[PDB]
Write an enzyme that holds these catalytic residues in place. Structure first.
Site, PDB file in Angstrom:
ATOM      1  N   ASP A 203      -2.179   2.206 -17.499  1.00 49.32           N
ATOM      2  CA  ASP A 203      -1.355   3.259 -16.925  1.00 49.32           C
ATOM      3  C   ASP A 203      -2.122   4.573 -16.908  1.00 49.32           C
ATOM      4  OD1 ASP A 203       0.971   3.993 -15.661  1.00 49.32           O
ATOM      5  OD2 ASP A 203       2.052   4.482 -17.502  1.00 49.32           O
TER       6      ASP A 203
ATOM      7  N   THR B 263       0.764   7.200 -10.667  1.00 48.31           N
ATOM      8  CA  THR B 263       0.117   8.253 -11.505  1.00 48.31           C
ATOM      9  C   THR B 263      -1.388   8.396 -11.234  1.00 48.31           C
ATOM     10  OG1 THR B 263      -0.198   6.736 -13.347  1.00 48.31           O
ATOM     11  CG2 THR B 263       1.852   7.993 -13.334  1.00 48.31           C
ATOM     12  N   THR B 264      -2.082   7.316 -10.874  1.00 50.66           N
ATOM     13  CA  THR B 264      -3.507   7.393 -10.563  1.00 50.66           C
ATOM     14  C   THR B 264      -3.786   7.940  -9.171  1.00 50.66           C
ATOM     15  OG1 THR B 264      -3.486   5.088  -9.834  1.00 50.66           O
ATOM     16  CG2 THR B 264      -4.078   5.517 -12.120  1.00 50.66           C
TER      17      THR B 264
ATOM     18  N   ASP C 299       7.724   0.339 -15.235  1.00 45.41           N
ATOM     19  CA  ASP C 299       7.339   0.731 -13.884  1.00 45.41           C
ATOM     20  C   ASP C 299       8.215   0.064 -12.837  1.00 45.41           C
ATOM     21  OD1 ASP C 299       5.395   2.477 -14.665  1.00 45.41           O
ATOM     22  OD2 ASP C 299       3.712   1.353 -13.823  1.00 45.41           O
TER      23      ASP C 299
END
Ligand SMILES: Nc1ncnc2c1ncn2[C@@H]1O[C@H](COP(=O)(O)OP(=O)(O)O)[C@@H](O)[C@H]1O
Ligand SMILES: Nc1ncnc2c1ncn2[C@@H]1O[C@H](COP(=O)(O)OP(=O)(O)O)[C@@H](O)[C@H]1O
Ligand SMILES: [Mg+2]
Ligand SMILES: [Mg+2]
Lengths: 527, 521
Positions: free
Chosen positions: B58, B91-92, B388
């Site tokens: 994550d 998030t990335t 998620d």
């Protein structure tokens, strides 16, 4: 702009990092080291390890889970293998070293494919496919046998097989019989479960190991309060209590005011009237023995001696509940609530004395149908007692697994050889570059016969080549490694039996742990 | 020189060099999580000061675990946290987009260009991209009750493709969809339990429509009472059942031994009155947040009833929501309407532990997950992967607009912005072109992780997207491109709408900084 050294991470100059294939190679080396350490303790001919504690205590053991728990490591991969072994032990209770050996072999086999230029996700997918194929093949060759109190022979054989690798193998027939009898006595059958709080394992150093036995009752480390009490009773009626033999005392803050000599004498009379009243209340119900969780007073002790009724003092809660379950009685909190319907019947209560020490213990035996039993272990060494306890725990866990599921396969590597053959056969129809991973899984699944043969002192490649040729020529998946040199390779004839869920757990857990290890590609740590 | 303005130790840096330094640091921050994107992305291992290890894929978790102290770099952590809190996925991608924007506009900054022009161009491009996404999103007004489930399942399976549980995504998507559809209208996350019990295989994970919780501390006699009921009644209490002083403020003053004996008897009378009041209501299972004494345990065991004490507040609330009772602080009004009902209650052995199961309630508004695995970090990563999917399903229940993934949307946005840029003159054209070029970092990173020839695939994607194939992206298994909308690679429009706004806002804030001043200590 002169991009001089600029600080991004706190303590930047004292932390290290490792990326790329170097991290994967380091992980593989650590796993190989752990597996190679654990290799030599596999099979009936395997040796054992001596572990020295932080305080200088010595433990001689053959259990892989205990060894890995007592080792202290820095490598995160090593800690992962330790946790894998512990999870296998918690779930099944046997085969905790074969799983780590298999995981090490599998990770070692993945290295050539890594060097040849294969993405590790492909390797993981191939491992998943091969594991599914092997598991699907495993239940096809299993045979169900039985669970009942009448026959018990297959259960005895399974317990013998599980105890064949330990230092207890001198009396393994006797201890297997003890284990199966205890589990069949305690087990609940309609719900298919057992409770290990109903089995109490205790051991005292001294005597001979063969003196180990099973008691369908309770054994505690106590004795009769007054030294002049009788040391045995043969038709004992037990009154189990949780209240001290003392005058009552309210829990909230209290004060009793004495303002006159008459009040003084009234209190003086009341104190002894209470002591007499409790003893008459206990005697009126016909009880012959009393057990209490707390202490007595001198007056109560002498009255109990005088009224011909022995008593036991300062026992524990678990012991009290075990005694109640065994004798069929009930635990009462007050003397006012004691009735003849709440007593327990015991066919013998005795005090046993050991050798030149003053240590004495109490045994309650010969009850009617009981849901609690105890194992009394004896031996000449403390480490002997500990290893006997561990072996007995393994046997009980295996019998519990048989209760849960009653279909088995045959050991000595026969199941592994058959699974390897099945995987190799299936891999011939997969064209999409995954045949390499499937064949790697098949190769790594054959490390158990290598370990067994090398421990037994024969030649691994020739032995397993001949065994596999015989298996493919004939149609007997029950052919393995003749470790004890009885002249046959037929484990069905030799009575080597293993549970199916154990093999399923080993394969699945090892495959998933290997996938997790392969997925990682970076590491950061301080210096 | 004799008396200085500021305190000694102050550090200052201004001009183009410090802006270039900030751009450089953001590149390292993006490089920290670069290789964790896509179905063929790896994960990272972080070891802290105390030796505790964390294995994670994550982006937000990795960035939090890194100890970043650079003021310009902290913004990329902040936007990742914001994205995680808002939508729960993506998030990335936002960090990669921000770093790509900064790297693309670095040379124009180096040429002496005024940063406010760049900021204006970024704002225009972001507004245009968001409007185009909202225009080309796909929705179904009145689809079905069953076509509202395949959408959620596809979204969950897409969300689970790059995680550790990728192989069992079809197995886990069904459970997450069921868990979300069994959940109220506020969709509270605390109404979903996650338990981790060692041993077993991943396929042994289960979902219980009801409740289940770990065994608590027990006294003598707990083994003498039954452990299975079919149609029981459940009492939930916040009362302490044991022999104790009435109040710590109390004190007893007495004169005679008869009154002393009566005082002794009164406490037992009080406790037994409470116990009989509980018993006469018909309840067969008793649960409390407060200790249950040994006297109470033996009393309940002597009448074939089950008791549990020190039950956690969250577990008790979930049990109440599942069964339909109410927490009682007084046993003086135990009516029927305050008693819970379940269709079966058991206690079972799971992997070395003992668990209490209440199952069979049809009016349940909650559920519980039992997760198996081989290690603590294995189970922790499984839980992180489940979260998620849960958040994505909640957002999709809220609004049901989806777009195809794999880089198709980014390619379409880049094509649109490139077409728009040719209309306007000046440096706005160059800046909008740079913004449009910065968007195709996602397909390039996907191909780089998978191990492809990214340049040829990008050329083919560009050639396809211009000829007229709105939803065309990379195919990981087929080594080529493919229509990702017919291959069921879906995601809600919010993930990209929020990613663009968040990334654009962080890029503007970093560029608009002139100098940095550090105070001592
Ligand atoms: N009499 C026997 N003949 C052949 N193989 C045996 C015999 N007894 C045990 N084995 C094998 O030894 C292997 C290792 O068992 P053991 O050394 O007890 O540790 P673990 O059961 O934890 O792997 C088992 O796979 C079993 O098949
Ligand atoms: N089956 C698939 N085929 C192609 N691309 C995929 C697939 N599943 C996910 N992706 C891509 O992976 C990206 C998601 O990356 P991931 O590492 O899961 O976390 P994040 O969503 O935070 O980037 C998305 O941009 C999506 O387009
Ligand atoms: Mg064994
Ligand atoms: Mg993601």
């Amino acid at each position: 702009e002169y991009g001089r050294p600029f600080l991004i991470i706190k303590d930047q100059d004292r932390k290290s990092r490792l990326m790329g294939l170097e991290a994967l190679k380091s992980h593989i080396m650590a796993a190989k080291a752990v597996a190679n350490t654990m290799r030599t303790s596999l099979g009936p001919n395997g040796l054992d390890k001596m572990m020295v504690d932080k305080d200088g205590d010595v433990t001689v053991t053959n259990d892989g889970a205990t060894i890995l728990s007592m080792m202290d490591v820095d490598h995160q991969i090593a800690k992962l293998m330790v946790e894998l072994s512990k999870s296998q032990d918690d779930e099944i209770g046997d085969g905790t070293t074969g799983v780590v050996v298999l995981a090490g072999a599998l990770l070692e086999e993945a290295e050539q494919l890594l060097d040849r230029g294969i993405h590790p996700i492909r390797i993981a997918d191939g491992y998943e496919q091969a594991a599914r194929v092997a598991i699907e093949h495993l239940d096809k060759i299993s045979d169900s046998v039985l669970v009942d109190i009448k026959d018990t022979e297959p259960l005895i054989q399974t317990a013998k097989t599980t105890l064949g690798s330990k230092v207890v193998n001198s009396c393994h027939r006797q201890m297997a019989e003890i284990a199966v009898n205890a589990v069949l006595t305690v087990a609940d059958m309609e719900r298919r479960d057992v409770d290990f709080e109903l089995i109490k394992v205790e051991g005292k150093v001294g005597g001979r190991l063969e003196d180990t036995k099973l008691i369908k009752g309770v054994i505690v480390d106590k004795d009769f309060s007054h030294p002049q009490m009788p040391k045995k009773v043969e038709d004992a009626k037990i009154a189990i209590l949780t209240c001290p033999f003392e005058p009552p005392k309210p829990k909230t803050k209290h004060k009793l005011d004495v303002t006159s000599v008459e009040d003084y004498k009234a209190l003086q009379k009341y104190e002894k009237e209470k002591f007499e009243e409790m003893i008459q209340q206990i005697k009126e119900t016909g009880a012959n023995l009393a057990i209490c969780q707390w202490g007595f007073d001198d007056e109560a002790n002498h009255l109990l001696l005088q009224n011909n009724l022995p008593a036991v003092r300062w026992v524990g809660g678990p012991e009290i509940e075990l005694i109640a379950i065994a004798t069929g009685g009930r635990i009462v909190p007050r003397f006012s609530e004691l009735t003849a319907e709440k007593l327990g019947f015991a066919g013998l209560v005795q005090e046993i004395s050991f050798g030149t020490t003053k240590d004495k213990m109490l045994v309650i035996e010969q009850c009617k149908n009981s849901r609690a039993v105890t194992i009394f272990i004896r031996g000449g060494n403390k480490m002997i007692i500990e290893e006997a306890k561990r072996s007995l725990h393994d046997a009980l866990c295996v019998i519990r697994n048989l209760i849960r599921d009653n279909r088995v396969v045959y050991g000595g590597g026969a199941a592994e050889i058959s699974c390897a053959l099945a995987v190799s056969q299936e891999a011939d129809k997969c064209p999409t570059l995954e045949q390499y991973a499937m064949r790697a899984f098949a190769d790594a699944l054959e490390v158990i016969p290598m370990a067994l043969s090398e421990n037994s002192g024969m030649n691994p490649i020739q032995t397993m080549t001949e065994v596999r040729a015989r298996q493919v020529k004939e149609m007997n998946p029950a052919l393995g490694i003749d470790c004890l040199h009885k002249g046959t390779n037929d484990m069905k004839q030799q009575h080597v039996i293993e549970t199916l869920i154990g093999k399923k757990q080993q394969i699945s857990l090892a495959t998933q742990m290997v996938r997790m290890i392969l997925k990682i590609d970076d590491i950061r740590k301080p210096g | 020189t004799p008396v200085i303005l500021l305190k000694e130790g102050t550090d200052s840096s201004q001009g183009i060099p410090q802006l270039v330094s900030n751009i450089s640091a953001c590149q390292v921050i993006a490089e920290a999580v670069r290789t964790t994107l896509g179905p063929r992305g790896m994960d990272k291992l972080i070891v802290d000061g105390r030796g505790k290890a964390t294995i994670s894929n994550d982006g937000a978790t990795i960035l939090k675990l890194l100890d970043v102290v650079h003021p310009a770099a902290k913004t990329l952590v902040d936007i990742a946290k914001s994205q995680d809190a808002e939508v729960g996925d993506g998030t990335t991608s936002v960090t990669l987009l921000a770093a790509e924007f900064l790297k693309q506009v670095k040379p124009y900054v180096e040429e002496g260009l005024h940063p406010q022009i760049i900021i204006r161009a970024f704002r225009t491009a972001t507004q245009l991209a968001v409007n185009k996404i909202k225009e080309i999103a796909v929705t179904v007004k009145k689809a079905d009750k069953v076509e509202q489930r395949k959408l959620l399942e596809k979204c969950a399976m897409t969300a689970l493709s790059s995680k550790l549980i990728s192989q069992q995504k079809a197995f886990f998507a069904k459970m997450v969809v069921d868990a979300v559809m069994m959940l109220d209208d506020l969709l509270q996350l605390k109404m979903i339990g996650i338990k981790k019990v060692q041993g077993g295989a991943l396929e042994d994970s289960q979902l219980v429509a009801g409740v289940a919780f770990k065994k608590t501390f027990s006294y003598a006699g707990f083994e003498m009472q039954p452990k299975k009921y079919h149609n029981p009644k459940i009492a939930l209490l916040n009362v302490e059942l044991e022999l104790k002083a009435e109040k710590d403020n109390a004190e007893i003053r007495v004169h005679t031994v008869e009154d002393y004996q009566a005082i002794v008897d009164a406490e037992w009378n009080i406790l037994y009155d409470k116990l009989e009041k509980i018993h006469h209501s018909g309840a067969k299972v008793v649960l409390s947040k407060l200790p249950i004494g040994d006297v109470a345990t033996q009393y309940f065991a002597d009448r074939d009833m089950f008791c549990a004490g020190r039950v956690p507040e969250e577990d008790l609330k979930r049990t109440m929501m599942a069964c339909g009772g109410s927490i009682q602080t007084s046993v003086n009004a135990l009516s029927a309407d305050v008693l819970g009902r379940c269709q079966v209650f058991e206690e079972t052995q799971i992997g070395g532990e003992r668990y209490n199961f209440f199952t069979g309630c049809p009016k349940a508004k909650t559920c519980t997950f039992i997760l198996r695995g081989g290690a603590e970090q294995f189970m922790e990563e499984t839980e992180r992967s489940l979260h998620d999917a849960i958040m994505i399903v909640r957002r999709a229940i809220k609004n049901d607009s989806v777009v195809a993934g794999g880089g198709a949307i980014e390619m379409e946005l880049s094509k649109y912005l490139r077409d728009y840029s040719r209309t306007i003159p000046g440096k706005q054209q160059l800046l909008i072109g740079a913004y449009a070029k910065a968007l195709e970092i996602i397909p390039r990173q996907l191909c780089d992780n998978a191990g492809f020839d990214a340049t040829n695939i990008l050329n083919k994607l560009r050639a396809r997207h211009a000829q007229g194939g709105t939803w065309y992206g990379v195919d990981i298994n087929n080594e080529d491109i493919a229509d990702n909308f017919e291959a069921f690679v879906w995601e809600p429009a919010m993930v990209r709408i929020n990613a663009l706004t968040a990334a654009s806002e962080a890029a503007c804030l970093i560029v608009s900084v002139d100098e940095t001043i550090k105070n001592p200590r």
